[PDB]
């Protein structure tokens, strides 16, 4: 039963200000890399929702109606 030294959780002013500057630099770098990099850029109906059949029937009926409504 020899208890060790506990890490302090008292906030250091210098550490907090340094973390602020580090975070601002990180945000600027992430924004720059997001602007510079190249990378190519609907969940539907949840299966547990009870009226899935009703929602599907409504969306099908609206699709079929709008098929002729915009045509004529």
């Amino acid at each position: 039963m020899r208890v060790r030294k506990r890490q302090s959780r008292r906030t250091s002013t210098k550490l907090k200000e340094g973390i602020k500057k580090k975070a601002s630099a990180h945000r600027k770098k992430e924004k720059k890399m997001a602007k510079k990099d190249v990378t190519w850029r609907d969940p539907g109906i949840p299966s547990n929702f009870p009226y899935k059949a009703k929602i599907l029937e409504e969306i099908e009926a609206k699709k079929m109606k709008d098929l002729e409504e915009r045509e004529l």
């Binding site: 299966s47 899935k52 059949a53 599907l56």
Partner: peptide, 19 residues
């Protein structure tokens, strides 16, 4: 009764999924 309802819900879910 209860198992009949569970089977009926199973059938309805399968039909919705295939549609």
């Amino acid at each position: 009764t209860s198992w009949e309802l569970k089977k009926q819900k199973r059938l309805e879910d399968k039909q919705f999924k295939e549609r």
